[PDB]
Design an enzyme around this catalytic site. Sequence first.
Site, PDB file in Angstrom:
ATOM      1  N   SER A 168       0.854  -1.195   0.000  1.00 33.49           N
ATOM      2  CA  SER A 168       0.000   0.000   0.000  1.00 33.49           C
ATOM      3  C   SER A 168       0.889   1.244   0.000  1.00 33.49           C
ATOM      4  O   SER A 168       1.666   1.424  -0.954  1.00 33.49           O
ATOM      5  CB  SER A 168      -0.984  -0.131   1.165  1.00 33.49           C
ATOM      6  N   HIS A 170      -7.883  -5.901   0.911  1.00 35.45           N
ATOM      7  CA  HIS A 170      -6.603  -5.214   0.985  1.00 35.45           C
ATOM      8  C   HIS A 170      -5.870  -5.559   2.275  1.00 35.45           C
ATOM      9  O   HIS A 170      -6.453  -5.532   3.363  1.00 35.45           O
ATOM     10  CB  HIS A 170      -6.839  -3.704   0.902  1.00 35.45           C
ATOM     11  N   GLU A 189      -9.423  -5.352  -3.774  1.00 35.43           N
ATOM     12  CA  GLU A 189      -8.693  -4.223  -3.207  1.00 35.43           C
ATOM     13  C   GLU A 189      -9.627  -3.200  -2.563  1.00 35.43           C
ATOM     14  O   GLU A 189      -9.271  -2.572  -1.558  1.00 35.43           O
ATOM     15  CB  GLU A 189      -7.843  -3.562  -4.294  1.00 35.43           C
TER      16      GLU A 189
END
Lengths: 531, 531
Positions: free
Chosen positions: B201, B440, B327
Amino acid sequence: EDAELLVTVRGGRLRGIRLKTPGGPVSAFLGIPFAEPPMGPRRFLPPEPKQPWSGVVDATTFQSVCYQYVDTLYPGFEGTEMWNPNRELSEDCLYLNVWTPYPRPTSPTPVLVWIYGGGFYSGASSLDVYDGRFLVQAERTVLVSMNYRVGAFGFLALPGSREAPGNVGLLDQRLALQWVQENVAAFGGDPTSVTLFGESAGAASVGMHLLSPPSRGLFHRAVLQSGAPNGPWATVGMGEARRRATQLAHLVGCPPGNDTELVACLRTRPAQVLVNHEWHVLPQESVFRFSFVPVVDGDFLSDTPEALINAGDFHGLQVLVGVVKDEGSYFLVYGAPGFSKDNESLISRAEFLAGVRVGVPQVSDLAAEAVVLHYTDWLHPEDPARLREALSDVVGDHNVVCPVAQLAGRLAAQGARVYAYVFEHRASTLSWPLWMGVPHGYEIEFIFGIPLDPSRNYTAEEKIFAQRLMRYWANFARTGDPNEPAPQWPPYTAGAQQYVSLDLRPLEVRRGLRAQACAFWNRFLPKLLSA
Amino acid sequence: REDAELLVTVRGGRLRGIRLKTPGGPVSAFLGIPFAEPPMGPRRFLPPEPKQPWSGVVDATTFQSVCYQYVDTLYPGFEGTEMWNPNRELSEDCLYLNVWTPYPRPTSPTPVLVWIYGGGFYSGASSLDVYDGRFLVQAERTVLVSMNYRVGAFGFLALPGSREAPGNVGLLDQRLALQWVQENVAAFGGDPTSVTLFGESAGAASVGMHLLSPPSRGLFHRAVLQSGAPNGPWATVGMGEARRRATQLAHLVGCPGNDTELVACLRTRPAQVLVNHEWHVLPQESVFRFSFVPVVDGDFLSDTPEALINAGDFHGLQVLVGVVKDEGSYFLVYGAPGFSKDNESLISRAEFLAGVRVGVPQVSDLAAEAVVLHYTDWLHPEDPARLREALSDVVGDHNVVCPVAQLAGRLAAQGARVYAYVFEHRASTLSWPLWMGVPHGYEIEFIFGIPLDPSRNYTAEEKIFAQRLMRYWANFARTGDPNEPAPQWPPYTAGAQQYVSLDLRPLEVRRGLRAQACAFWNRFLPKLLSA
Ligand SMILES: *[C@@H]1O[C@H](CO[C@@H]2O[C@@H](C)[C@@H](O)[C@@H](O)[C@@H]2O)[C@@H](O[C@@H]2O[C@H](CO)[C@@H](O)[C@H](O)[C@H]2NC(C)=O)[C@H](O)[C@H]1NC(C)=O
């Protein structure tokens, strides 16, 4: 003497002809004058009713074709020649034709009125593929078709002027519809049951009569085959119509400014001279664009067809609409780079990108980029076969499928009963190459029952198919519903979006007239163009 | 007395570490090594200062403090959020790094993995249980380094051009840690000529920024970018907007003009006071946006990451990139209307259209309409489950998948060897609800081999799977190729676009990192935003 072939209409007496079909005879009255010849000082002006005549008009043969461009892309090729004039060209062309059963019906018979297509630049009621004898014999309707002015003679417009007001070819159609109201009962037709049907520009004309109040009282239902009045090709704004009319004058040696002198000079030109310069007034190289089309000037159409389709109450209307499987393919050989009927037309990506500007003319680069985004398979961006199919989809969606889908959805959501089809049978006799699929125009011969002609080579299954289609169309003309007491054809609605496939197999119900693609053309692209 | 394996001399002086137990055997750990002077008081907002040498022995025997940061309170006591929250005391005194090495120390130079945590540049810590480096080191015999870096205002408040608060100091913390690795890692047995950065990320975005910044680029040799890219629309901010946010924060906490005076006033404010106002400076309600992020000011980044990716020459570089299967889902419960972890989040059409503006903040209405067009199924425009999945795709494609795909495609085309994955295993222990899929952040625990922790309950299959991913990652660090010196993992290229799915099944090769969607985000939409 055969009294069945003698008819008196309001203007005087007519003599028709008895025709043969495999199912028996029909009565035909061909070349009936419905307007004064729009010659000389009457060129570009609204039609006038035909004045009464003495004696007997001979109505045994088709009359002249309205002056129009003749296709020369593939000389002698059946796929193009079948649409070219098959009678002499003349400005004296405002005639119509009536087919009835033999002997003439003595009970009011439902009436079908055919309006031919041809981009508002061409077409004729005398084409072999519009022969009304099979429909009339099989389904016992009265069939009427009219000639109407095309090209500059029908749609040249200097808006605001009295000498070239525009849309007179649509008033030709309207006058023919009024003629049907006043005279069709003399043939056994029922003026309270008139169904208009037409293809391409004929379908667009049908839609325009739906949206023009003086036409609306002249018919009761509508069939729009592969066309719609909200097509990007079907109308022009006043400014662009004036620019085109003025460029035509310049190209044929006429001044300049003053509309009266401009039109007076145009009226001195041989008809063929105007034809010879018709295509050169278009703003750019393109496919699926025609120079002289209906103009939105607030008279025949008080607003754009799109706007009128959004504001209207269509309760009490039944419409039948549809498209062929491959609307765009035929149009690509008229200017898309790398296309031809004589090869596989496996274009490169560069040719595909160039084709987008030809097939979506006069839009910003950003709008073109949006088209390329939606029609590219980004896992196979350069595959020639996919590119060929994609550009065919671009042209067919933009010009036919999505205008038809928008019309269908708005009418249904606003109270009309709508039936939708996709025609998916490729004629065994089709002369166009296989990559074109089911091209634009090739459902007409089945709707008219041409396969029943024993001197043609259609198969036994295709004749049964033709009879099925004639039955659907005539069922709809009689009742507003194509179905019979057999799988059912359900109405099209904005939500379920149901349509049927027309081919040799029984009806199959499907959802969505290219819904993902048409959301782009009908919902998003207009927002992009205005912002 | 002393264990020689746990005593190391670096430049600053001597350190003492601990012997960690792992299921497969002992590991040496040096936790809480100071690599900068504490950025306290007068040093807040300033670039890191290198650690001054010390006499005696520093006990590097436990994780040091978490850099001061917002603590998530959306779901108090919930494992799925608490696992990302600080697990040490908050402090501005937080510039420490961690080294794990085999026990006994390697005889010969050993490849180095350097972890950069994510957390949107507002949160994160190298001490999180899921970043425990002991299993990677023991399973694959690499050296693992992780560092803390300043987040939120302390790391990325920028008044561009100022001396007091130049911005990007959190990135300079990471850089100083990488310089520390170059100068010191050999004393632990690590090889400074074989350093692989990996991050997730915002950590992946950080890795990419080091790739694009020449002074960082000479400090490592390969890069792994997990679910993030420096060209993400959340990962950088322009100079003007950074100044506006910093000025807004100052105004909200009473400060004060001269950047000197305003930063001086901000330095007198308690750290928690700044944190309490951090989210208020965002220009609108959103998801997947963070107040203080890297600024493009010409120094650390001489241009936008996009321009640097497009202009860069990447020969000699190997990169491994990927995303998880879903995601977007985790981010929707932080503000998308109708979304909750505690219900199925089956939203209405109206909530979807509202969610688009939250998930794609600060774009024109036309841009939003383009998003709606692409992510609506126009055969099911109002289906709740499809709308929930579509909004997840919007947020995931826009913020993660399409930035990663653009980076991978452009690097592969410009000389780099790229490997791509999609992680598709939902952990048996996952506490987030089923509708979120593979959210995620939930590949991380498998990359670090957390399933091998005896106190946790993963299945035996998940431990095998964890071991295989550790092997891929370490193979890539050692050789630039995740494949074993067996299904093979092919390189990603801009044409074929091949990636592999990572799950309990053997590798499966697929094509396209959501190619149709990412063509919209990466090729078309920037053109729309310009015009
Ligand atoms: C699904 O839940 C969301 C979130 O609401 C919260 O969590 C719920 C499970 C429940 O515990 C609520 O009391 C919580 O407020 C619901 O969206 C919320 O709806 C409430 C009341 O209608 C409203 O006050 C909030 O503003 C909404 N929050 C958001 C983010 O939109 C949603 O209605 C639930 N869906 C259902 C009922 O299926």
